[PDB]
PDB file of C-alpha atoms (C1' of nucleotides) and ligand atoms in Angstrom:
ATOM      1  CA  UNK B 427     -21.527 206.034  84.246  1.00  0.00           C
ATOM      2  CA  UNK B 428     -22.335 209.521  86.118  1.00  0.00           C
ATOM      3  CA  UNK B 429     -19.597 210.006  89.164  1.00  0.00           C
ATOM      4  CA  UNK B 430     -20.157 213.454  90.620  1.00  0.00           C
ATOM      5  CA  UNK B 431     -22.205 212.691  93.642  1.00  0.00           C
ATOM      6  CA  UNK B 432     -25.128 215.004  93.591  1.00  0.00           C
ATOM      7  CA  UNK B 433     -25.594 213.561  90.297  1.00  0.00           C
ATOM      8  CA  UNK B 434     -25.695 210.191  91.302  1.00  0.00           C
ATOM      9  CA  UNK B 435     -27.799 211.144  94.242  1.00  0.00           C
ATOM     10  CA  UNK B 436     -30.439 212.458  91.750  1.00  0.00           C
ATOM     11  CA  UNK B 437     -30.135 209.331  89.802  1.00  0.00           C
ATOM     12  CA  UNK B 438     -31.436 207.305  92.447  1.00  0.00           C
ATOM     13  CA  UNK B 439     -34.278 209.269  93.573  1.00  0.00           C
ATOM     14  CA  UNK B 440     -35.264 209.719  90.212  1.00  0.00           C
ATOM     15  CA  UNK B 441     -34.993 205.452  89.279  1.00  0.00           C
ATOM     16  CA  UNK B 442     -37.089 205.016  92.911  1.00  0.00           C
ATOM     17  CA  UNK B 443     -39.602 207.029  91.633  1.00  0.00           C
ATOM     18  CA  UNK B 444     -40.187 205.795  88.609  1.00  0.00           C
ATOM     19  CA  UNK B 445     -43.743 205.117  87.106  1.00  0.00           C
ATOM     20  CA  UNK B 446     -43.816 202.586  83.748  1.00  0.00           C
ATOM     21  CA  UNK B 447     -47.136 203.175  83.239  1.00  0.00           C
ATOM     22  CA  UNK B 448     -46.778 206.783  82.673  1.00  0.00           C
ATOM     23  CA  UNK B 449     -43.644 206.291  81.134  1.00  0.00           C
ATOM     24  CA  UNK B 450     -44.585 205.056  77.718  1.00  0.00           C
ATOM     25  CA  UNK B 451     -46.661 208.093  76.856  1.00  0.00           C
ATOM     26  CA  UNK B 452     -44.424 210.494  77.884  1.00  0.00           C
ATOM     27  CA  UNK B 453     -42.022 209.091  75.548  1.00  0.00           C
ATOM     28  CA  UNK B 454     -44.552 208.527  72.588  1.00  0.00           C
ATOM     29  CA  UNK B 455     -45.243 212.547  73.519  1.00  0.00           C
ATOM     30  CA  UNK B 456     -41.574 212.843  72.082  1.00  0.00           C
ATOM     31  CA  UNK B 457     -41.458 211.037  69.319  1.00  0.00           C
ATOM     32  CA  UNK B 458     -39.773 208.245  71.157  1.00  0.00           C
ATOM     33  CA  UNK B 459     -36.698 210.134  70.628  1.00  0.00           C
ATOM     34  CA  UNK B 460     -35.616 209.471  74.745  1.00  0.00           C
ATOM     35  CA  UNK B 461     -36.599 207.152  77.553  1.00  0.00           C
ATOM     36  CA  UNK B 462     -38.133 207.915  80.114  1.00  0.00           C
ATOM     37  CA  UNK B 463     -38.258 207.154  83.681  1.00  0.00           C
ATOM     38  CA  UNK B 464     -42.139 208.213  84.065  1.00  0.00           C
ATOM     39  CA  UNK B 465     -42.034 211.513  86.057  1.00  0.00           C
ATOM     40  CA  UNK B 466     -43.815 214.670  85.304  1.00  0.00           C
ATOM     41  CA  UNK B 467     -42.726 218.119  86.185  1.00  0.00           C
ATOM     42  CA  UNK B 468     -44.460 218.315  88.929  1.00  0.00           C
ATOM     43  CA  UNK B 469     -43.025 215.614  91.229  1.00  0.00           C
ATOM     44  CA  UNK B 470     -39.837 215.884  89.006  1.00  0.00           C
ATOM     45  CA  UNK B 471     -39.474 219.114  90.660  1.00  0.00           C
ATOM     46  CA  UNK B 472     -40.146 217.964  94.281  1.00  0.00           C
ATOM     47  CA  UNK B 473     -37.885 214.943  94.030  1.00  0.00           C
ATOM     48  CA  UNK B 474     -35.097 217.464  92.734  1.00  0.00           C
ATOM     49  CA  UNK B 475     -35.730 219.650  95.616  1.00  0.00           C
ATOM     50  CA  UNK B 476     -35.552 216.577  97.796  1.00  0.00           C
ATOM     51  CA  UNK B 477     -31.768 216.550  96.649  1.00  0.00           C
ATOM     52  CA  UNK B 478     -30.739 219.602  96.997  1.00  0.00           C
ATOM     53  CA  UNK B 479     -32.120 220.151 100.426  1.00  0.00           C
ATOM     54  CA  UNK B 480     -30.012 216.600 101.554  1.00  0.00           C
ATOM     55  CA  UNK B 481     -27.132 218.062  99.631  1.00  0.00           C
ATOM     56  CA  UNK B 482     -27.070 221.612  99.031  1.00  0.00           C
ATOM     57  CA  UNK B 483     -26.284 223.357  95.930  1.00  0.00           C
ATOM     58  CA  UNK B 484     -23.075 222.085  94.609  1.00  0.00           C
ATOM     59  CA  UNK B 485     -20.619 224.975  94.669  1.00  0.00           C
ATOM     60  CA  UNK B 486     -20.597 226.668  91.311  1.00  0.00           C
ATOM     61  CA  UNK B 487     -17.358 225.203  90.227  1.00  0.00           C
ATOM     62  CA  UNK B 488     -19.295 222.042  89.254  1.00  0.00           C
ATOM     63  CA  UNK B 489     -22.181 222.996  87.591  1.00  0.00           C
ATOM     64  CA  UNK B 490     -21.186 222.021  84.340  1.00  0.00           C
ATOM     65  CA  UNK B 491     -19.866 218.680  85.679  1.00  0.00           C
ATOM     66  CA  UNK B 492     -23.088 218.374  86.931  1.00  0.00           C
ATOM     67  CA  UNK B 493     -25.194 219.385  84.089  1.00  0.00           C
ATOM     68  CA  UNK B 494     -22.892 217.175  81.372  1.00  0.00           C
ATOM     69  CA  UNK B 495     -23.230 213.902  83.057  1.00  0.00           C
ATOM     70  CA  UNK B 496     -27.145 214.725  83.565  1.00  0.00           C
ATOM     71  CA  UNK B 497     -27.341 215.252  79.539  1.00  0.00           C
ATOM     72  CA  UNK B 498     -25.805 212.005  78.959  1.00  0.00           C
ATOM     73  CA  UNK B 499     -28.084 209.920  81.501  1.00  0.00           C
ATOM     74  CA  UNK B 500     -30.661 208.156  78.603  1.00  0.00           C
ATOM     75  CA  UNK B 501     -33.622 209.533  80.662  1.00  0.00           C
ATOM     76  CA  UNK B 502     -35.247 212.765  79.722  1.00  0.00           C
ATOM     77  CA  UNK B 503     -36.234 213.397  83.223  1.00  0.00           C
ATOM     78  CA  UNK B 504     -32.728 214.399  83.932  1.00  0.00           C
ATOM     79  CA  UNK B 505     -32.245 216.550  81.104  1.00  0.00           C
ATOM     80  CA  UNK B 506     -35.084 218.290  82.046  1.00  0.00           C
ATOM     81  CA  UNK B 507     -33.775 218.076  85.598  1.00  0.00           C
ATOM     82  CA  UNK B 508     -30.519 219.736  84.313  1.00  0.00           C
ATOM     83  CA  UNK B 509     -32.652 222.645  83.204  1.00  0.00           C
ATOM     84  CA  UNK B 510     -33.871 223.225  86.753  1.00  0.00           C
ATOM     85  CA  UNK B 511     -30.700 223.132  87.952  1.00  0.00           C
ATOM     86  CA  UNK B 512     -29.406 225.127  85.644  1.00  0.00           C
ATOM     87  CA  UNK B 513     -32.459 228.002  86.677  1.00  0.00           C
ATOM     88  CA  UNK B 514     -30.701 227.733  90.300  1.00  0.00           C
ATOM     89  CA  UNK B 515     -27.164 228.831  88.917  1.00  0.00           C
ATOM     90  CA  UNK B 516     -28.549 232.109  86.573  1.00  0.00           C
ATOM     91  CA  UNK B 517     -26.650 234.491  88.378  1.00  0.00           C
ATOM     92  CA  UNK B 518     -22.696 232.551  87.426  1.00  0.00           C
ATOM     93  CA  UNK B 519     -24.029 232.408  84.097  1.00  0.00           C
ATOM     94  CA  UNK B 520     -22.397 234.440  81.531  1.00  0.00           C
ATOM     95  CA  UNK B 521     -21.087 235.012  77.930  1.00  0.00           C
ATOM     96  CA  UNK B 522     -18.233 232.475  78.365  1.00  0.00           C
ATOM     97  CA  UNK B 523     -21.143 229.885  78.982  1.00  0.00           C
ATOM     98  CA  UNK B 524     -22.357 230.459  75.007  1.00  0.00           C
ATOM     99  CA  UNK B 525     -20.740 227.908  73.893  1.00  0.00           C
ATOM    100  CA  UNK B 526     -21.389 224.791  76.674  1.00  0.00           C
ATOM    101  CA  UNK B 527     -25.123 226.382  76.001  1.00  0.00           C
ATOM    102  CA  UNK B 528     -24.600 225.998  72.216  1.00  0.00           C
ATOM    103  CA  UNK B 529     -23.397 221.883  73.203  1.00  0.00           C
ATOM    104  CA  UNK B 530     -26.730 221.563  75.090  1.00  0.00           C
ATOM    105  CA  UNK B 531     -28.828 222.897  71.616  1.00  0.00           C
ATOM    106  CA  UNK B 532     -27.300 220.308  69.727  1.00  0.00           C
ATOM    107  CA  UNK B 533     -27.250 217.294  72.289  1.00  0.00           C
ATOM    108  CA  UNK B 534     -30.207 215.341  72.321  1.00  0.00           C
ATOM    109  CA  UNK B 535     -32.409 218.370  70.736  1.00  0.00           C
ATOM    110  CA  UNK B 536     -36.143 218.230  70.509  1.00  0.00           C
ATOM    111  CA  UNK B 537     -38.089 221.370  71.561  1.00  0.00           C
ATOM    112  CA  UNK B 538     -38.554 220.338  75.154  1.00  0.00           C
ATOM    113  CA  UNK B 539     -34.905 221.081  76.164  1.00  0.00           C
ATOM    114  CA  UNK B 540     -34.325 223.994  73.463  1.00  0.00           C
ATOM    115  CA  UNK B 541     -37.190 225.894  74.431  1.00  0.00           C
ATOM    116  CA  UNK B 542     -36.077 225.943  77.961  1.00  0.00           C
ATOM    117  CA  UNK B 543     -32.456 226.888  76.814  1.00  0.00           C
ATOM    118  CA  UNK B 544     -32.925 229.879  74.455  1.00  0.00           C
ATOM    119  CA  UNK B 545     -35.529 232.214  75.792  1.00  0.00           C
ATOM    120  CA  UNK B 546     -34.452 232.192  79.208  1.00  0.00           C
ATOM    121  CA  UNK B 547     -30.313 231.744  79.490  1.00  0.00           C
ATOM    122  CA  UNK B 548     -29.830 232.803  75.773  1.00  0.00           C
ATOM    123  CA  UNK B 549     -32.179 235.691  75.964  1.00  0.00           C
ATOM    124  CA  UNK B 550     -30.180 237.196  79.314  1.00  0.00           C
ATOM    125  CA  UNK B 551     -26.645 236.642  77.809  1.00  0.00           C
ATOM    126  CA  UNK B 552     -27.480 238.694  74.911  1.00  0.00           C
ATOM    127  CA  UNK B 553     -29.479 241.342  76.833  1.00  0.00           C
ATOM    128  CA  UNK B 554     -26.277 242.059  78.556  1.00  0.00           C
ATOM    129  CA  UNK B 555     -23.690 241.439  75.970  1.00  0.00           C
ATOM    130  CA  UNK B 556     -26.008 242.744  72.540  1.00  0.00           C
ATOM    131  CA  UNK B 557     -22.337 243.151  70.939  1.00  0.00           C
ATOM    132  CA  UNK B 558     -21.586 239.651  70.827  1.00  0.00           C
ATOM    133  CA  UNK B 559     -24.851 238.359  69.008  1.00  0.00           C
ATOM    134  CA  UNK B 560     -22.985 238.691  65.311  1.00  0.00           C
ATOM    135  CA  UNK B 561     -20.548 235.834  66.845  1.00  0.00           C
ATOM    136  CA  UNK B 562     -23.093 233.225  67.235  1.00  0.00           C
ATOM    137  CA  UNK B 563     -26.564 234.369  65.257  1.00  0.00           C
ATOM    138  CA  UNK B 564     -25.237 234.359  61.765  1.00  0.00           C
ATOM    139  CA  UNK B 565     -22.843 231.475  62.694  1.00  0.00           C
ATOM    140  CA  UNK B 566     -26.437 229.486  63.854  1.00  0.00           C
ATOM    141  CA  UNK B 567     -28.159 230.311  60.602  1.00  0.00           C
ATOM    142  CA  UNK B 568     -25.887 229.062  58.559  1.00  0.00           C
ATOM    143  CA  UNK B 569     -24.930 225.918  60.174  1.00  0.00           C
ATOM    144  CA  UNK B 570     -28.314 223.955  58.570  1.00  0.00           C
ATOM    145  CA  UNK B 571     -28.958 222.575  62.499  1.00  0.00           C
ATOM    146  CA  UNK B 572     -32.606 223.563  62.714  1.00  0.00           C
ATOM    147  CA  UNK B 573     -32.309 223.776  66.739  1.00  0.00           C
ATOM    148  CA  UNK B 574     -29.442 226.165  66.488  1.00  0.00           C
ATOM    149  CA  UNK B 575     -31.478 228.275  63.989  1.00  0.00           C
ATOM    150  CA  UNK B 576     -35.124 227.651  66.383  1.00  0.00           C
ATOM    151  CA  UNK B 577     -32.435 229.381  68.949  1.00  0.00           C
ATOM    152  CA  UNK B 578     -31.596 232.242  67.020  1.00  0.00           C
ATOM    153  CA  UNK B 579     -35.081 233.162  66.071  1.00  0.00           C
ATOM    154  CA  UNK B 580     -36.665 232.338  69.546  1.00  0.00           C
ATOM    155  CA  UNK B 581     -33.715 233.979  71.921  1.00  0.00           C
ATOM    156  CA  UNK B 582     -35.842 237.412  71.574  1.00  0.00           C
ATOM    157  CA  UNK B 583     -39.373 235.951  72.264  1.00  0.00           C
ATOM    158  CA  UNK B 584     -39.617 237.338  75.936  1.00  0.00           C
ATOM    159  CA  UNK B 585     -37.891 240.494  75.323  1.00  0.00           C
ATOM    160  CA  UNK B 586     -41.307 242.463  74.861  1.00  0.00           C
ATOM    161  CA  UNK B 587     -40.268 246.220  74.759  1.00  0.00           C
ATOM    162  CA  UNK B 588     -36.390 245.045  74.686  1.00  0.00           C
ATOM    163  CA  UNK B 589     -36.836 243.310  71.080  1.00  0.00           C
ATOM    164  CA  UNK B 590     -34.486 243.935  68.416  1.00  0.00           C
ATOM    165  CA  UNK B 591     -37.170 244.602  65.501  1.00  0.00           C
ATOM    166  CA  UNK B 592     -34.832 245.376  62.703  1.00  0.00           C
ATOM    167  CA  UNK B 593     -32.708 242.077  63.898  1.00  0.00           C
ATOM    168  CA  UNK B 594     -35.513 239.540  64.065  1.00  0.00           C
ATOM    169  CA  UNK B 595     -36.798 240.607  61.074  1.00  0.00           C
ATOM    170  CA  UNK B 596     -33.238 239.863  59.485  1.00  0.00           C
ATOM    171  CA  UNK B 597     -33.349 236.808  61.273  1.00  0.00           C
ATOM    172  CA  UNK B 598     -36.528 235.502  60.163  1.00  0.00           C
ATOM    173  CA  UNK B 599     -35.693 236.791  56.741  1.00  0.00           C
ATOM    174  CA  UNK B 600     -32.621 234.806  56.548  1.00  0.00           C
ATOM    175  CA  UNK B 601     -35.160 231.301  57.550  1.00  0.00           C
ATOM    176  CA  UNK B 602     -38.660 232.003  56.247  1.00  0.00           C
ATOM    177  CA  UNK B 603     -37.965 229.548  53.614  1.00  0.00           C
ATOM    178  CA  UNK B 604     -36.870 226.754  55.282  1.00  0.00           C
ATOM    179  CA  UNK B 605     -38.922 223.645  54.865  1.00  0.00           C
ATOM    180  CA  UNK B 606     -38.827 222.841  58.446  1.00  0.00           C
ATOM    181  CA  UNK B 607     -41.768 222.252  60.673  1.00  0.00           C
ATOM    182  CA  UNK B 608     -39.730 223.693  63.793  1.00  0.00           C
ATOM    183  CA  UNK B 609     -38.585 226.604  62.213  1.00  0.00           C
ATOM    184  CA  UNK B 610     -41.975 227.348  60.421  1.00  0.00           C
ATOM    185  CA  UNK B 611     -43.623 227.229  63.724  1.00  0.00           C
ATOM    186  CA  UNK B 612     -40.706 229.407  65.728  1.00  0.00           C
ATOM    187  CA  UNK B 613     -41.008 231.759  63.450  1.00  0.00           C
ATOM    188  CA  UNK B 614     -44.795 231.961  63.666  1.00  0.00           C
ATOM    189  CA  UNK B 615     -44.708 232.041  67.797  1.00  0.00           C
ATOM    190  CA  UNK B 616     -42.012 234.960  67.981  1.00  0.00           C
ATOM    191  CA  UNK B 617     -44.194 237.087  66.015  1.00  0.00           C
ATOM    192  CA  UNK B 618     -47.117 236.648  67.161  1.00  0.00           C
ATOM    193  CA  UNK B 619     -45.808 237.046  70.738  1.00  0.00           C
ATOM    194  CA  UNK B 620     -44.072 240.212  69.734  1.00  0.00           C
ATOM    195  CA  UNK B 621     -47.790 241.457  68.470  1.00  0.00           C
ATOM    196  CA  UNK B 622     -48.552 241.517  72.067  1.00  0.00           C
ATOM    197  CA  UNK B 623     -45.955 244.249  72.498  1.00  0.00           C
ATOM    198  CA  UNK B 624     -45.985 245.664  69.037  1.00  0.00           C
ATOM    199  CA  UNK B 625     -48.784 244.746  66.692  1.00  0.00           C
ATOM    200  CA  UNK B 626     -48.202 247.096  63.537  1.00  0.00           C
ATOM    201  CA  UNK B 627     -44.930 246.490  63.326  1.00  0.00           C
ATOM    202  CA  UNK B 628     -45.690 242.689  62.763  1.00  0.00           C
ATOM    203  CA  UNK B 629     -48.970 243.235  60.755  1.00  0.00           C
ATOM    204  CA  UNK B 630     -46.461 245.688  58.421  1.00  0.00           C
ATOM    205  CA  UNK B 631     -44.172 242.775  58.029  1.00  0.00           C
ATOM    206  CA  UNK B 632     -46.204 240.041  57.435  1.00  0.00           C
ATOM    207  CA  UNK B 633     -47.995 241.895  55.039  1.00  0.00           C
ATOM    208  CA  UNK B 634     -45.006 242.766  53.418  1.00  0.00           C
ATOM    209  CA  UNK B 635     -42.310 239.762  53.674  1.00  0.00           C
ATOM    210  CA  UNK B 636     -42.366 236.177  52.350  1.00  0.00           C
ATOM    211  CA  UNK B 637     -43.542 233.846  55.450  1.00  0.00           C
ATOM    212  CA  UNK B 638     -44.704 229.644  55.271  1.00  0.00           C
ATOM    213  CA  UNK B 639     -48.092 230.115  55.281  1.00  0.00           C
ATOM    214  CA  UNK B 640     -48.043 227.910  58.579  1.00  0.00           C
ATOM    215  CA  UNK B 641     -45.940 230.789  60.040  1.00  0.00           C
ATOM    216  CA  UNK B 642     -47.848 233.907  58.481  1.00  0.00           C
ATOM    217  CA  UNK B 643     -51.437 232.097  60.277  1.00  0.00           C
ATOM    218  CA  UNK B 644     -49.537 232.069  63.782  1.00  0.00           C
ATOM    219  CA  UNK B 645     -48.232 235.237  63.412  1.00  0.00           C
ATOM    220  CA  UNK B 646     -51.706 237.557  63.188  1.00  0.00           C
ATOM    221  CA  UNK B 647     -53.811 234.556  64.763  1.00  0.00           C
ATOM    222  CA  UNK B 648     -54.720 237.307  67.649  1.00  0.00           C
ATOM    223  CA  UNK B 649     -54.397 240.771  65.771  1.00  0.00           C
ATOM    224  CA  UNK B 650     -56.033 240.388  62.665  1.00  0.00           C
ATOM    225  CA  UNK B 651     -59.201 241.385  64.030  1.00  0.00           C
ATOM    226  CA  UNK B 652     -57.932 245.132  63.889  1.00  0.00           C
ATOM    227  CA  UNK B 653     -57.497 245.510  60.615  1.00  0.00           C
TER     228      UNK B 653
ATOM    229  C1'  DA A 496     -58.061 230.415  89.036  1.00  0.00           C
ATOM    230  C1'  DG A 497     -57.752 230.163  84.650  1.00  0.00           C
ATOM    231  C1'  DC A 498     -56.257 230.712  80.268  1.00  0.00           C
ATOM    232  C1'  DA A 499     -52.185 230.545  76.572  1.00  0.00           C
ATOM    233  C1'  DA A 500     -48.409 227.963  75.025  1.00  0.00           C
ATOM    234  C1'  DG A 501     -46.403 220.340  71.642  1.00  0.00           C
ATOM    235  C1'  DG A 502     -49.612 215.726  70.030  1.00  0.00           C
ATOM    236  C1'  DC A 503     -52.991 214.026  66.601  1.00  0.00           C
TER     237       DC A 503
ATOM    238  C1'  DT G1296     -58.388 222.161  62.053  1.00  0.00           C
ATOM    239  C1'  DG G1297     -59.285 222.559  66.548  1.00  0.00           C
ATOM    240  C1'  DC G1298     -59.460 219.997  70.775  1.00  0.00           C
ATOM    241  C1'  DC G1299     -56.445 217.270  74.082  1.00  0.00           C
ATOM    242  C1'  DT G1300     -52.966 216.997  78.092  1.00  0.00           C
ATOM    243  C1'  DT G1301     -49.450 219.329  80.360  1.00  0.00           C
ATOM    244  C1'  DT G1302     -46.680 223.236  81.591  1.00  0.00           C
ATOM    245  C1'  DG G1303     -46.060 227.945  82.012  1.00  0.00           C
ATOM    246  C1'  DC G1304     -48.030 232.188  84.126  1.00  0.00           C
TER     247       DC G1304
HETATM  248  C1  YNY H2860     -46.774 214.925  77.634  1.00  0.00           C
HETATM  249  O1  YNY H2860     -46.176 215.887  78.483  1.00  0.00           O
HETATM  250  C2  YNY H2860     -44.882 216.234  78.378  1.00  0.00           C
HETATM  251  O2  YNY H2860     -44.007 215.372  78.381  1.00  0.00           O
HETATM  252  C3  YNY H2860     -44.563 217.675  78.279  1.00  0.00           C
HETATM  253  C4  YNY H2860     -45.442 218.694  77.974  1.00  0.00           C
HETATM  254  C5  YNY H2860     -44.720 219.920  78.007  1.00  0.00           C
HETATM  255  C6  YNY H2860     -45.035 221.237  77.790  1.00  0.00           C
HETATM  256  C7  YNY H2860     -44.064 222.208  77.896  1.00  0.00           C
HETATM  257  C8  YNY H2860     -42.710 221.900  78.224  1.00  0.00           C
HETATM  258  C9  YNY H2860     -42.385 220.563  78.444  1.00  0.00           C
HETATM  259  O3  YNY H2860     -41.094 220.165  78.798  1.00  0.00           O
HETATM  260  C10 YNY H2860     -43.372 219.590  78.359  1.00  0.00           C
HETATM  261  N1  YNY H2860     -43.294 218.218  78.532  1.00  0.00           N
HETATM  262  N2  YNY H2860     -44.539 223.482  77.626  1.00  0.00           N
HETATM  263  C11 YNY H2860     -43.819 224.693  77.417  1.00  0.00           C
HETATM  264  O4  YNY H2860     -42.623 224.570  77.274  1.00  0.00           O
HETATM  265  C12 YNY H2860     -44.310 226.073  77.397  1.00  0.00           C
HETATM  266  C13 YNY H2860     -45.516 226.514  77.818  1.00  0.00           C
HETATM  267  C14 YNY H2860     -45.535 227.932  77.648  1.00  0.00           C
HETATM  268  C15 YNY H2860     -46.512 228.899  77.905  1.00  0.00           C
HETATM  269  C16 YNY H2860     -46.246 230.217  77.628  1.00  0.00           C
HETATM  270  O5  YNY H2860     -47.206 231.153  77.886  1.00  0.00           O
HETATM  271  C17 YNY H2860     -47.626 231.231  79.235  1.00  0.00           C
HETATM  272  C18 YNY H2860     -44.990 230.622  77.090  1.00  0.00           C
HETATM  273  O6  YNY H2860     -44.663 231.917  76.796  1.00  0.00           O
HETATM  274  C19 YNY H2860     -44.859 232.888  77.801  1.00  0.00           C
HETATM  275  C20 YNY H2860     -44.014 229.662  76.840  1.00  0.00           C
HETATM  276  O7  YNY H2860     -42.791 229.966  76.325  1.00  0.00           O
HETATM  277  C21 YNY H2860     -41.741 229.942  77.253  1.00  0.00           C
HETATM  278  C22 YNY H2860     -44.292 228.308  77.113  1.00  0.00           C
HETATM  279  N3  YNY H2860     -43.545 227.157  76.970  1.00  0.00           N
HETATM  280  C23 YNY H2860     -46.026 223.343  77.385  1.00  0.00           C
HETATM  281  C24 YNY H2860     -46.323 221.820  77.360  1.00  0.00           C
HETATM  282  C25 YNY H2860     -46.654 221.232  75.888  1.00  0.00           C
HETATM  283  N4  YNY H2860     -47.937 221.738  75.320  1.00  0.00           N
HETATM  284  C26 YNY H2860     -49.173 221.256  75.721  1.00  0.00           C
HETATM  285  N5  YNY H2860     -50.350 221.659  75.309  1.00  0.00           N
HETATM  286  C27 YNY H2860     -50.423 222.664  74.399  1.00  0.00           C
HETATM  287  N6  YNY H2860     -51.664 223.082  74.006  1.00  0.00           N
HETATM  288  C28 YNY H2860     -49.240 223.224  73.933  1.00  0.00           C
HETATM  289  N7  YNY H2860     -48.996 224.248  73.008  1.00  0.00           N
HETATM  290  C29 YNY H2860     -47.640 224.321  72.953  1.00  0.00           C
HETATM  291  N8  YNY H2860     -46.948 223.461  73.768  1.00  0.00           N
HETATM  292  C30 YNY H2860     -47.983 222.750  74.402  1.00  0.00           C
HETATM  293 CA1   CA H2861     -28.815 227.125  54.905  1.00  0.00          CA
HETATM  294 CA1   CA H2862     -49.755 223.935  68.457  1.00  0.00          CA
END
DNA sequence: AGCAAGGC
DNA sequence: TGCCTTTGC
């Protein structure tokens, strides 16, 4: 049972607020992996909001107290919720988080959650701390947990002019032949959101490197028209 | 605004 | 396959 208050707090609002009628598609949208309470982002957000404003922000001391018993509730709503949270603490955030991040990937995974994780708090660790990547990328790829390996292929996707070409090439060259739906389809989104920054340096790999088809598709879906 | 980004 | 709903922007 969550204790820390704030947590509790949230609990409620969220439970009052609940809608069963949206609630069984939401969790259909998922696979019926999680419950769900019935809330979508946009009151979600509000009803946080609500919280903190009664509250304030707990003092950072507690934010992964807070976070932790918010991954355990069975509801995705406060998963989710524990993302926006988490968005309010960015600045205390920092390479001795990697691995409470890296217990997040793996607990209750499905793309909602790890998508949220990796691009955003992911992406700014290693944009400060670029020495530290051969820790944890390799150590992702090899562990055979597809949501660790989405994260090490998606961490770069909003880097834009900051990408690491010769590493996400590696990286992508270490997973192109995994059979997995969610790393065919990672693959195919970083590159073909890296085209946006630097199309002939994808078109020249594609072109060139082993992909899934499913991947190849995604990744020149916008620039083959140029060529 | 409006368009770009899982489900089926 | 390409359109849907929703979220991100
Ligand atoms: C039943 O409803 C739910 O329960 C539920 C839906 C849902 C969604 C989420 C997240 C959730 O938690 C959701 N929950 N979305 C994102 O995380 C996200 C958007 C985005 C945009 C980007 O461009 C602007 C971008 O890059 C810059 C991104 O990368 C960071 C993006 N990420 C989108 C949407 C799911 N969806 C719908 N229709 C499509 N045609 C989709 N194609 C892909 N996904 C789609
Ligand atoms: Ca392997
Ligand atoms: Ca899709």
């Amino acid at each position: 049972v969550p204790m820390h208050p704030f947590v509790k707090a949230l609990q409620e609002h969220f439970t009052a607020h609940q809608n069963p009628e949206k609630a069984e598609p939401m969790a259909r949208y998922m696979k019926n992996h999680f419950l769900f309470l019935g809330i979508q982002t946009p009151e979600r957000r509000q009803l946080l909001k609500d919280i903190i404003q009664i509250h304030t922000l707990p003092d950072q001391k507690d934010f992964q107290i807070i976070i932790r018993e918010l991954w355990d509730l069975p509801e995705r709503e406060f998963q989710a919720a524990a993302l926006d949270i988490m968005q309010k603490y960015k600045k205390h955030i920092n390479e001795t988080h990697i691995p409470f991040l890296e217990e997040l990937i793996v607990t209750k995974s499905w793309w909602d959650s790890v998508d949220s994780i990796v691009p955003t708090f992911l992406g700014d660790i290693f944009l400060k701390h670029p020495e530290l990547i051969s820790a944890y990328i390799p150590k992702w790829i090899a562990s055979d947990n597809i949501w660790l390996q989405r994260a090490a292929i998606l961490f770069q996707l909003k880097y834009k002019q900051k990408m690491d070409e010769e590493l996400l090439f590696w990286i992508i060259g270490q997973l192109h032949s995994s059979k997995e739906f969610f790393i065919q389809k990672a693959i195919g989104w970083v590159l073909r959101e890296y085209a946006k920054t630097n199309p002939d340096v994808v078109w020249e790999y594609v072109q060139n490197n082993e992909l899934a088809p499913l991947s190849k598709r995604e990744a020149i879906k916008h620039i083959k028209q140029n060529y």
